[PDB]
Design an enzyme around this catalytic site. Structure first.
Site, PDB file in Angstrom:
ATOM      1  N   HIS B  46      26.685 -55.842 -83.096  1.00 42.31           N
ATOM      2  CA  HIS B  46      26.661 -54.693 -82.037  1.00 42.31           C
ATOM      3  C   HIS B  46      25.193 -54.677 -81.530  1.00 42.31           C
ATOM      4  CE1 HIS B  46      27.994 -53.150 -85.950  1.00 42.31           C
ATOM      5  NE2 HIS B  46      29.130 -52.952 -85.354  1.00 42.31           N
ATOM      6  N   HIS B  48      22.131 -52.815 -80.741  1.00 36.84           N
ATOM      7  CA  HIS B  48      21.320 -51.423 -81.433  1.00 36.84           C
ATOM      8  C   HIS B  48      20.336 -50.987 -80.334  1.00 36.84           C
ATOM      9  CE1 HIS B  48      22.587 -51.653 -85.703  1.00 36.84           C
ATOM     10  NE2 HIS B  48      23.218 -52.725 -85.244  1.00 36.84           N
ATOM     11  N   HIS B  63      23.158 -47.835 -83.449  1.00 37.38           N
ATOM     12  CA  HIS B  63      23.770 -48.717 -82.328  1.00 37.38           C
ATOM     13  C   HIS B  63      23.622 -48.009 -81.161  1.00 37.38           C
ATOM     14  CE1 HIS B  63      27.296 -49.714 -85.249  1.00 37.38           C
ATOM     15  NE2 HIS B  63      26.343 -50.186 -85.613  1.00 37.38           N
ATOM     16  N   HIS B  71      31.147 -43.845 -83.193  1.00 34.42           N
ATOM     17  CA  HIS B  71      31.590 -45.214 -83.379  1.00 34.42           C
ATOM     18  C   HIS B  71      32.953 -45.640 -83.145  1.00 34.42           C
ATOM     19  CE1 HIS B  71      30.768 -49.458 -84.870  1.00 34.42           C
ATOM     20  NE2 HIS B  71      31.878 -49.270 -85.745  1.00 34.42           N
ATOM     21  N   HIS B  80      30.544 -46.303 -79.145  1.00 30.19           N
ATOM     22  CA  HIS B  80      29.105 -46.557 -78.622  1.00 30.19           C
ATOM     23  C   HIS B  80      29.140 -47.545 -77.652  1.00 30.19           C
ATOM     24  CE1 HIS B  80      27.870 -45.075 -83.119  1.00 30.19           C
ATOM     25  NE2 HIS B  80      27.976 -44.361 -82.268  1.00 30.19           N
ATOM     26  N   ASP B  83      29.061 -51.027 -78.977  1.00 34.64           N
ATOM     27  CA  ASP B  83      30.062 -51.597 -80.258  1.00 34.64           C
ATOM     28  C   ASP B  83      30.789 -52.745 -79.788  1.00 34.64           C
ATOM     29  OD1 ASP B  83      29.246 -49.469 -81.854  1.00 34.64           O
ATOM     30  OD2 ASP B  83      30.833 -48.128 -81.470  1.00 34.64           O
ATOM     31  N   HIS B 120      26.056 -58.410 -88.681  1.00 32.48           N
ATOM     32  CA  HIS B 120      25.846 -57.553 -89.885  1.00 32.48           C
ATOM     33  C   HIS B 120      26.424 -58.397 -91.097  1.00 32.48           C
ATOM     34  CE1 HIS B 120      24.533 -53.595 -88.581  1.00 32.48           C
ATOM     35  NE2 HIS B 120      24.845 -53.985 -87.534  1.00 32.48           N
ATOM     36  N   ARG B 143      21.554 -56.161 -92.073  1.00 29.31           N
ATOM     37  CA  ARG B 143      21.559 -56.652 -90.801  1.00 29.31           C
ATOM     38  C   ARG B 143      21.156 -58.244 -91.193  1.00 29.31           C
ATOM     39  NH1 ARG B 143      18.854 -51.835 -87.082  1.00 29.31           N
ATOM     40  NH2 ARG B 143      20.636 -50.497 -88.148  1.00 29.31           N
TER      41      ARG B 143
END
Ligand SMILES: O=c1[nH]c(=O)n([C@@H]2O[C@H](CO)[C@H](O)[C@H]2O)cc1F
Ligand SMILES: O=c1[nH]c(=O)n([C@H]2O[C@@H](CO)[C@@H](O)[C@H]2O)cc1F
Ligand SMILES: [Cu+2]
Ligand SMILES: [Cu+2]
Ligand SMILES: [Zn+2]
Ligand SMILES: [Zn+2]
Lengths: 153, 153
Positions: B46, B48, B63, B71, B80, B83, B120, B143
């Site tokens: 993603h 962020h 995000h 999401h 988002h 995403d 992630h 993360r």
């Protein structure tokens, strides 16, 4: 206000953190933070053109120069937008940074966000060193630490 | 064309390099590169909101969501901007990334430059996980590596 931030890291002991704040759109930008691991003396301090760290700090290219000017110091009319002069470390290896600059911006064509902040090996001569390289890089030498300038909360 | 780049690093073994290229101002962005050091399987991927890595990847915030949507996955309407779904690692811990996305941009309001790309711990469930967190983070966990997306040459 608009805010940005940069974490400086490299291949050696130099690392730091630099914050940017711009209270008014197109207004002055406050720049503050701390850099450690430095040799005593001056270290050139610039925004470089690209936010590319693929191969390390070299990938950032030349100083950020949207107006195609020659290198100078921050107080000079004739400067690169990215020319923030020098940070100065004491024997403790720390430079405690607190600058205001009115040429860099966190928006518009002079926006430094997404570009690389670099702290250099040695002094920037602010374009006054008397060779052609002075008017390009300030003879500030290699790139000790760098990071990409990012949007902050 | 407009280009951007991100070097992914964190506190453990995960590291990578991701390139972005956008041929036209309004147009799709190609995203490609490689990430290594991963466990086999899916890892949420993603953009962020903040390009802040002060305290590590946590500093990057939620995000990137300039449209206040929920999401989802990259192929969903309800997503988002940030995403990008999952990268998938084989047994060797390598994910070989090559996608195209029409929602992110390298300019304007959907611009991801100056923000943080994160890989992630866990799979992103693309908002289909059946809990409130699914429609916020995809339940992708911690993360592992991140970097600030920067302007490229
Ligand atoms: O999806 C892609 N994957 C990829 O690896 N690339 C790389 O980028 C170059 C072309 O732009 C190389 O041909 C190729 O290795 C570009 C892509 F668009
Ligand atoms: O040298 C500094 N300069 C500076 O302006 N600040 C502060 O700058 C303020 C902006 O109004 C605060 O966000 C705070 O970070 C802190 C400093 F350490
Ligand atoms: Cu420099
Ligand atoms: Cu994420
Ligand atoms: Zn310069
Ligand atoms: Zn999301």
């Amino acid at each position: 206000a608009t805010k940005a931030v940069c974490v400086l890291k490299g291949d050696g002991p130099v690392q730091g953190i630099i914050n940017f704040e711009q209270k008014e759109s197109n207004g002055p930008v406050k720049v503050w933070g701390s850099i450690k691991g430095l040799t005593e003396g001056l270290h050139g301090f610039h925004v470089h053109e690209f936010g590319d760290n693929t191969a390390g700090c070299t990938s950032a290219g030349p100083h950020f120069n949207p107006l195609s000017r020659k290198h100078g110091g921050p107080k000079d009319e004739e400067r690169h937008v990215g020319d923030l002069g020098n940070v100065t470390a004491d024997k403790d290896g720390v430079a405690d940074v607190s600058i205001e600059d009115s040429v860099i911006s966190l928006s518009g064509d002079h926006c430094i966000t997404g570009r690389t902040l670099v702290v250099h090996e040695k002094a920037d001569d602010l374009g006054k060193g008397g060779n052609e390289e002075s008017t390009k890089t300030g003879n500030a030498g290699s790139r000790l630490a760098c990071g990409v300038i990012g949007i902050a909360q």
